[PDB]
């Protein structure tokens, strides 16, 4: 699971793009097939869902799910 | 670069805490409230460091710096913000 | 003096990272991979900043600058080199 590591790196990248005073994420960035460095070929689908301006869920098919709100990876 | 050494230490404490979450529930061990020790090398500019748990998922790190461009750093896990104050 | 401001920022990132080394082993925490925050005041010329760890001791900082005499600056801890105009 090179896929898991990629997902964690997408999350880290998203954390770095938060507004530094409010925490808000740009909520139109919903694709993580590109724009997050080298993607291992095992990752065939990657979407970011924003639940509000702070919280996101990354879903990747290789299925793995990262939730920013609780920091869990499944 | 004391302010930078302090801030970066705080970010490293947060990353360490993230790694210690329960992998199914996300819960943190909420008795770990001191960050003066237990998080690797602490730059000497950091003279106070406390972690406050607002619930089982969310924490706030507060650090005080000596001889730095600012005095207090606060990191909030819930919104991912880092603030620094004189 | 944007190139100078970006260069100065990168050097401050490096100095901050040095402060986090274990003083017996030299090892750094290797999950702090961006330097857009947590390293003091960042000049607005610095639009991207990443830290790559090549092993537990050695890192490379890459920063992208806009409106500067160079576009990218790179610091390597192993050789202490920083992009400089000849």
Residue numbers in the entry:
A (entry chain C): 41 to 102, 109 to 120
B (entry chain B), C (entry chain A): 38 to 123
Task: Pull verbatim passages from the article behind this deposition.
Type IV pili (T4P)1 are long, surface-exposed filaments which extend from the surfaces of bacterial cells.
Tt122238-123 adopts a typical pilin-like fold, with a central α-helix packed against a 4-stranded antiparallel β-sheet. There is a trimer in the asymmetric unit, with two Tt122238-123 molecules (chains A and B) aligned approximately parallel and a third (chain C) bound in the opposite orientation. The modeling indicated that the structure of Tt122238-123 could be incorporated into the pilus fibre model, although some repacking of the core helices would be required to satisfy steric constraints (not shown).
